[PDB]
Amino acid sequence: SFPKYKPSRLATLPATLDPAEYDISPETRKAQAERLAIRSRLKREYLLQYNDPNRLGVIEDPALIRWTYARSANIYPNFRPTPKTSLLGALFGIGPLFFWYYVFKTDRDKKEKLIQEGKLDQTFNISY
Amino acid sequence: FSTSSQLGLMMVTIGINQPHLAFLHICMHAFFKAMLFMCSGSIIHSLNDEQDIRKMGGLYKAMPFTTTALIIGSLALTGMPYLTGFYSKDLIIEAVNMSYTNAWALLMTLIATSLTAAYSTRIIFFAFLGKPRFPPLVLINENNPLLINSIKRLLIGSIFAGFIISNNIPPMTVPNTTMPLY
Amino acid sequence: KRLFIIKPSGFY
Amino acid sequence: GAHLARRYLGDASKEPDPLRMPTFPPDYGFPERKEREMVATQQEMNDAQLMLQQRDYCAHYLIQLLKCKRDSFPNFLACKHEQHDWDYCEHLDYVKRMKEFERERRLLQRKKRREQREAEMA
Amino acid sequence: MLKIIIPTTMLLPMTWMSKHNMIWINATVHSLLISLISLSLLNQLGENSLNFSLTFFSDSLSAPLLVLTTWLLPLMLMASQSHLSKETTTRKKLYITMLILLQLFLIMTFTATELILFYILFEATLVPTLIIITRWGNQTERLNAGLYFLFYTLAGSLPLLVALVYIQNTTGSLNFLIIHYWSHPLSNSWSNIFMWLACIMAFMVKMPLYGLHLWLPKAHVEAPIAGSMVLAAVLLKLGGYGMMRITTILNPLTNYMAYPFLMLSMWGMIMTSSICLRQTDLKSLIAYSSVSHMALVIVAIMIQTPWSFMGATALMIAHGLTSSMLFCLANTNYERVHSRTMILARGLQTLLPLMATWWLMASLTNLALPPSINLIGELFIITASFSWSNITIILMGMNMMITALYSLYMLITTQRGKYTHHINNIKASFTRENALMALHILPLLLLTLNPKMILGPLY
Amino acid sequence: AYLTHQQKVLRLYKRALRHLESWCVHRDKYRYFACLMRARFDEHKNEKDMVKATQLLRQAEEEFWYGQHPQPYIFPESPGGTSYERYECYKVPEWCLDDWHPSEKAMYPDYFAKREQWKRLRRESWEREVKQLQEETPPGGPRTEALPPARKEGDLPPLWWHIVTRPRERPM
Amino acid sequence: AGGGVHIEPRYRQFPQLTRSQLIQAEFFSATMWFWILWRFWHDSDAVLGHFPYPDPSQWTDEELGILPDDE
Amino acid sequence: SKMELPDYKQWKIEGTPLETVQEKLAARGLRDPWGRNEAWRYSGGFANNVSFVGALLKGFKWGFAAFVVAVGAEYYLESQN
Amino acid sequence: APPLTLEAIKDRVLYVLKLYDKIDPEKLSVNSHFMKDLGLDSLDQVEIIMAMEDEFGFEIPDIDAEKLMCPQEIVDYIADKKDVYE
Amino acid sequence: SGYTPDEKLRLQQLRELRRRWLKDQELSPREPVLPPRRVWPMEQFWNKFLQDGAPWKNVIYKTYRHSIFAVTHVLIPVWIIHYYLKYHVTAKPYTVVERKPRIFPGDTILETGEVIPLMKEFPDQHH
């Protein structure tokens, strides 16, 4: 045959390749009218206020400040201490720290194992 | 890419303990690689904002000087005696060849140099060899003397290059004189 | 013929 | 290369490994090791500012090459003759090193046949 | 040293009795005058500090801070010109009083000769800033902003007080000179490690430290424009200036138990920088980048290498400036659009080219591009860390991965790019913004040529 | 809205030879190919029940996508090319004309006089263009992203300002 | 513009290549042909490998100091 | 002036190999519509772009003017001595 | 790039239709609407759209590429796309 | 397949309105009214020198363009650096360091004239 493309998180399957978008059905044809209408009014309430000579200010987007509040404020009022949240916090908080502790504690003492009975080079290291 | 392939060669010479041979390589590197982009940009200006090979043909007759500049610039880079390639590309290929090096460190240089000789003609073909592939509105031109001047001021570099300074610079390279010819 | 090119107010 | 092919694809005991060579004394089969001498002494190259990697036994034509080149300016196109007799010691030294590689090689071949004939008889 | 203290003390009758129109004209015209008066304190000896009196003294470490504070004070004046024009005159005089009183407490704090005198004037600064943050703030959460500020700082401040009086009863004096000359090794007893914990955690909190840093995102973002710069520019750095002062008697326990802090800074600096690249609020970026640079100087003091103390001072002033232009710039987009979302306003050079010029040079200043003292101080930290541990570079080298990954990122989505065709609010740049921009960035290139004075006492 | 065979195979035939011309480069080869895909495209324009018409269409897209030139040719001025959004850097809105400095206002007086009457006809016709649009607007707002014209007498075609005052495609 | 374009082009013909750019193109082409074949015989030894390399089988053990398999 | 459009049939499809690819469809049983759309690229002065070898030996004729002088000048150098 | 004019740019496209051997030179009209005034329908139109696009430089968007169908309504768009008042 | 009359007048009403914008966007014949500037007199004499367009006059003016380019962008710059290094920087020791030239046998040092040991004989290579 031929090589076959596969969907991915960033290499998503194209609409052209997916036969599902090609499944013409009454539910999808009737559905498109609503998105057409809601985008139409949004285009309408974009243009009138934008094209209004009296609108000397900034026309805000309701979707914009819903997202800004969502991404920062809504987290903790909706946060729940599930077991997985503790685990992720462990492996992204204290976990990575102990990674740096063990690696940094080791070489530090490994250096300290060098100086005392003189096996380290200090020929030029006079800028301690 | 043919630069980054070349930047993958000067430090090969110092990888075989050849500093100055790397150093002369970059001098010629700038001498012809400036042009290859210079004439290429001339195509983008003469033929309205076009860059891809597959949108223009017959650039020999319609674009003579840039054709000559592209010919010698590729000719300079593709190791040719008595130009940039001779004192630099011929010198480096021979130098890594007879100096102590890993087999594949050698192998890429001959392959890449062949590839540099390969796609240099691939764009020369698509540039000039082929019927015109530009929109009917004919606007391709280079009569602007200042563009013409700028090319010839660097032309002397692209054909003369190292020779102007070959014997002028002191020899820091340890020569081999005799060595197998293949 | 030459059209008009608008820029940000600069004198300030 | 033939030497590379014989060492890896064939036998490395009969092929001089570049790092391991030389493996035999220069007097083994080649007597009268009368130490060769170049000309322009270590002060000369020091006073010549000569490159360490180039301060070889061909140092004699090197510095005299840069002698005339010191006065060849303005014309860069000069001193071709003294340029390529320096290449002649570099020619001579190269084949001498080529001689060295094969001299060990011919000793390496002989060494195989030597032990083969002086250890397998019994 | 009352050359500088008294004229600032007197500045309160000055602004309070000034006429209706001038006030701010009055406030600046004399605050610049005090600035060059404080510019005198650039006179240092070799190592013996400038001991002006029994209670007041300064050194090569304090003086760059004094000039930073005194010269800062005019900047929030002009910065607050736009934001606070509508308000009546009496509160206008009161607001300037808070700024002057704040700078007043700063200059005495940096110049105290007795540890407790430093402490009383250390945390005396939250009282005016609490007024500034809470009263004059803009968004609703500002109420909780102040609570987070004082309670975090105080939660470590009181342990310091108990520790300080203990040293008084033990050694007999908390004065810097006496405690330095009679410095004694702090042993490894469990009592002493908690003493070290008491004398360090106070500054660590308003350092901040990774995990102990929530106040700045919840304060600087919602602080008033003037208040926001002052917190990050200098009020960050009382703990630092204190830190190099109290670290003269905590040896050798520092080299033994600074690892958890060196940990939390190193991972935090990458962590804070990475999250800095992933905020939707531009004001949070300068806040999160601030601690990222600030986490670096805690590393400097912990190793207490001479080279580390070199860059601790330089980066302090460098970042202390660096946060200032960005907050000034981030302000300029705000009131024009009444939002702090970088997504809403993009490609402002097509409308404000000169503002963009200031934006990028402040950004590359944050990048620590030499010869700017941002790099050289920041670089000295790298060298000291490598002396401490050669491996250290990778984690901090990851910090030279995220900084420019965000520090040019808002450029290409605030000043650089295309413009949305709906904001007709954006107008020309009032010369005040560019003017304060000039006094903000032009210094950093100036003393760049001569880094020895702001290098620190280790010269 | 939803796409039907005609809209979609016209979409197909655009990309298909865009790959083909980029595949062949030289005109004549692609010329013979492009005109024979035309016959290959009409070789089946009589298919029975739409299920096959859809199913053969599915076979068209898959071979198209793997027959899609991996490096196809895109005209620079269009999305995906070198000149795409190139001149947006020179794009600048029209409201910067208003805040021009009075000394500079008197250095371009005629052009500011023309903008005065251009913004004049903006204001005197904005309210009439919008009121007519709302009354002729069907209930539930607009049912599509359409625009009514100046169908009546002495009016401007509603929502015209920004699109009439759109910056030129080469602002230079 | 109106008062210029001395390379005044047209539709679907040769872009009126003035002789200058032609005899310029042939000039430096002749110059660089002259330059590189002039040394192709002046100092051809530079590229030809002026000095030859000896095949090493063409040597004798007497001058190479290997004693034959008799000692 | 006006970027003048010359007559339609100057760049006409005949003579060009466009018929061959058009008759290639006639070999299949149809025709090609974009012949004279590109005939200007084959007809006119663009006809017969110089071959690759002729491209890379550009200037070799005036080059031959240079060889004889070059060797002749070189022959002059040691013969006159 | 010249001060491109609609008159020049359309006379380019009326050539393409007269260079369309299917669209007879006598069958040329500024309003030669392909499927019903000419007979070459949407399929016999979209390839011409690419043909003009191949010779125009710009790529007319697909939503109106299949739709702008009468030569004057196309040349209206290059007037829009180039945005020249001539 | 089909512009509705609604949108047909929409485009056309949009077309010439924007075309009239560009018609009103033309740069005015008046443009630009410019208040008086400062015209320097030496450049007045300099441009008036070469108005007649003789080949020598144009060359001299561009030579003078190069001349003032020499004096204050080259010749003054070499002055103030020359004054800088050998009079101030070299007044400070070790700021300017110099490798000794590769003195070569047969040469005489300027002070003592000592002929650096003359090169001995060669192993006589020649080709």
UniProtKB/TrEMBL annotation, chain C:
UniProt subcellular location: Mitochondrion inner membrane
Role, per record: Accessory subunit of the mitochondrial membrane respiratory chain NADH dehydrogenase (Complex I), that is believed not to be involved in catalysis. Complex I functions in the transfer of electrons from NADH to the respiratory chain. The immediate electron acceptor for the enzyme is believed to be ubiquinone.
Family designation: Belongs to the complex I NDUFB5 subunit family.
Subunit description: Complex I is composed of 45 different subunits.
Name of the featured protein: NADH dehydrogenase [ubiquinone] 1 beta subcomplex subunit 5, mitochondrial
Organism: Sus scrofa (Pig)
Lineage: Eukaryota, Metazoa, Chordata, Craniata, Vertebrata
TrEMBL record, chain G:
One GO CC term, this protein: mitochondrial inner membrane
Tagged with keyword DNA repair: no
Keyword hit for Electron transport: yes
Keywords associated with the record: Electron transport, Membrane, Mitochondrion, Mitochondrion inner membrane, Respiratory chain, Transit peptide, Transport
Mode of membrane association: Peripheral membrane protein
Transmembrane segments: none
Major subcellular location class: mitochondrion
Subcellular location: Mitochondrion inner membrane
Physiological role: Accessory subunit of the mitochondrial membrane respiratory chain NADH dehydrogenase (Complex I), that is believed not to be involved in catalysis. Complex I functions in the transfer of electrons from NADH to the respiratory chain. The immediate electron acceptor for the enzyme is believed to be ubiquinone.
Assembly behavior: Complex I is composed of 45 different subunits.
Family: Belongs to the complex I NDUFB2 subunit family.
Name assigned to this protein: NADH dehydrogenase [ubiquinone] 1 beta subcomplex subunit 2, mitochondrial
Species in which this protein is naturally found: Sus scrofa (Pig)
Portion of the full-length sequence here: 34 to 104 of 105
UniProtKB/TrEMBL annotation, chain H:
GO cellular component: mitochondrial inner membrane
Domain of life: Eukaryota
Record key words, sorted: Electron transport, Membrane, Mitochondrion, Mitochondrion inner membrane, Respiratory chain, Transmembrane, Transmembrane helix, Transport
Membrane-topology annotation of the record: Single-pass membrane protein
GO biological process, any: electron transport chain
Chief localisation class: mitochondrion
Intracellular or extracellular location(s): Mitochondrion inner membrane
Signal sequence segment: none
Family: Belongs to the complex I NDUFB3 subunit family.
Biological role stated in the UniProt entry: Accessory subunit of the mitochondrial membrane respiratory chain NADH dehydrogenase (Complex I), that is believed not to be involved in catalysis. Complex I functions in the transfer of electrons from NADH to the respiratory chain. The immediate electron acceptor for the enzyme is believed to be ubiquinone.
Protein name: NADH dehydrogenase [ubiquinone] 1 beta subcomplex subunit 3
Organism, scientific name: Sus scrofa
UniProtKB/TrEMBL annotation, chain I:
An annotated GO BP: fatty acid biosynthetic process
Subcellular location: Mitochondrion
Main location: mitochondrion
Keyword flag Transmembrane: no
GO CC term, one of those recorded: mitochondrial membrane
Stretches assigned to the Carrier domain: 7-82
Keywords, comma-separated and alphabetical: Electron transport, Fatty acid biosynthesis, Fatty acid metabolism, Lipid biosynthesis, Lipid metabolism, Mitochondrion, Phosphopantetheine, Phosphoprotein, Respiratory chain, Transit peptide, Transport
Entry similarity comment: Belongs to the acyl carrier protein (ACP) family.
Biological role stated in the UniProt entry: Carrier of the growing fatty acid chain in fatty acid biosynthesis.
Name the UniProt record assigns to this protein: Acyl carrier protein
Originating species: Sus scrofa
Included range, full protein: 71 to 156 of 156
